Amino acid sequence: PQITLWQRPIVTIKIGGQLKEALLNTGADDTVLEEVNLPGRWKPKLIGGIGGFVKVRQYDQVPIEICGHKVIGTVLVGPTPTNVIGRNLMTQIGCTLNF
Amino acid sequence: PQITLWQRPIVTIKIGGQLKEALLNTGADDTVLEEVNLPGRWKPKLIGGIGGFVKVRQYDQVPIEICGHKVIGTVLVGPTPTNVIGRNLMTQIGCTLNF
Ligand SMILES: CC(C)c1nc(CN(C)C(=O)N[C@H](C(=O)N[C@@H](Cc2ccccc2)C[C@H](O)[C@H](Cc2ccccc2)NC(=O)OCc2cncs2)C(C)C)cs1
């Protein structure tokens, strides 16, 4: 699709057997989601850093559907003020900025 | 242009007689820049919110050139870890997300 930016670009995703809402965020390197239970192995990752770091669980090669595009990528699971799709998954869906 | 998202979408802007670099950030409602001196009237604005608010100066109807597109919009001037072009100016340049 083509998404204009008059409102926040919130989209529906399908992950770990759930439908969630998340923000398409070109300002974020990584994808961070809260309250999803993902199977298999993970390793801890420190993110943020200003004022301290936040520890999250890094899951690799996660299948995720974003607007009906089935892709694979890293998902960080942990506390976040809002669910964020970052550049790592936007590249996978072939999402670009255009003007 | 078409900007892919494998790297951070940093672009050159012209503002307040200066060339600056800023991040095209679809996760940000507003545009926040530091170390720019803008003429005329402003009013304080509280932004952020998590852990406290940050006070910045809100300038309206500022002429700004973003990748050669001359546009007009609100610029918040104040401390920011990185210069951010938010949705308010992306709409002005006609910037969309596409996949
Ligand atoms: C909480 C939720 C309901 C939201 N609040 C908002 C309102 N706010 C505050 C903003 O629009 N904020 C803007 C902003 O930066 N956007 C933030 C929104 C936000 C708000 C509150 C708490 C946490 C994040 C989200 C932005 O993408 C920020 C801005 C930024 C980017 C790079 C470097 C420095 C700074 N950046 C990031 O999210 O980077 C985090 C990364 C994660 N993985 C790699 S980088 C301002 C700078 C203009 C939007 S969505």
Give the HSE-up count for residue B75: Cα atoms under 13 Å, Cβ half-sphere.
28
Output the six-digit token pair for A65: 């559907």
Instruction: Show me where the domains of chain A are located.
Output: 1-99
CATH 3.40.50.800 fits B1-99, yes or no: no
Nearest residue to A77 (alpha-carbon basis) of A93, A57, A97: A57
A99 contacts B67? CB cut-off 8 A: yes
Tell me how far apart the alpha carbons of residues B59 and B89 are, in angstroms, rounded to a whole number: 13
Taking the CA of residue A57 as centre, how many other CA atoms within 13 Å lie in the half-sphere pointing to its CB? 14
Residue A27 C-alpha to ligand 1 middle, in angstroms? 7
User: Helix, strand, or coil here: A9?
Assistant: coil
* Amino acid identity at B30: D
Residue identified by tokens 């057997």 is A17
Bridge partners, B97 (sequence order):
A3, A97
Tokens of A56: 């999250």
Q: Does ligand 1 have an atom closer than 6 angstroms to the CB of B73?
A: no
Three-state DSSP at B5 gives coil
Q: Which residues contact A31 (CB under 8 A, 6 or more apart)?
A: A22, A73, A74, A75, A76, A84, A85, A86, A88, A89
Q: Is residue B85 within 8 Å of B65, Cβ to Cβ? A: no
Q: Is B89 in the pocket of ligand 1 (CB under 6 A)?
A: no
Secondary element (H or E) of residue B97: strand B96-98
Q: Over the Cα atoms of chain A, what is R_g?
A: 13
Within 8 A of B95 by CB-CB distance, chain A residues are 5, 97-99
Helical H runs in chain B?
87-93
A80: helix, strand or coil: coil
H helix or E strand, kind and range, residue B66? strand B52-66
DSSP character for B51?
T
Give the residue ranges of DSSP H helices in A25-80.
Answer: none
Q: Give the number of the atom of ligand 1 that is nearest the alpha carbon of residue B86.
A: 48
What gap in Å lies between CA A48 and CA B7, rounded to an integer? 18
Are the CB atoms for B30 and B85 separated by under 8 Å?
no
**Which SS3 state, helix, strand or coil, does residue A89 take?**
helix
How far apart, in whole angstroms, are the C-alpha atoms of residue A16 and residue A19? 9
Q: Which two tokens stand for residue A38?
A: 């993902």
Query: Which residue pairs, CB below 8 angstroms and at least 24 apart, start in B42-50?
Result: B42/B77, B45/B76, B47/B76, B47/B78, B50/A81
Contact flag A99-B99 (C-beta cutoff 8 Å): no
Query: Residue A27, SS3?
Result: coil
Residues 5-64 of B with CB under 8 A from A: 5-6, 8-9, 23-29, 50-51
Is the separation of the CB atoms in A25 and A84 below 8 Å? yes
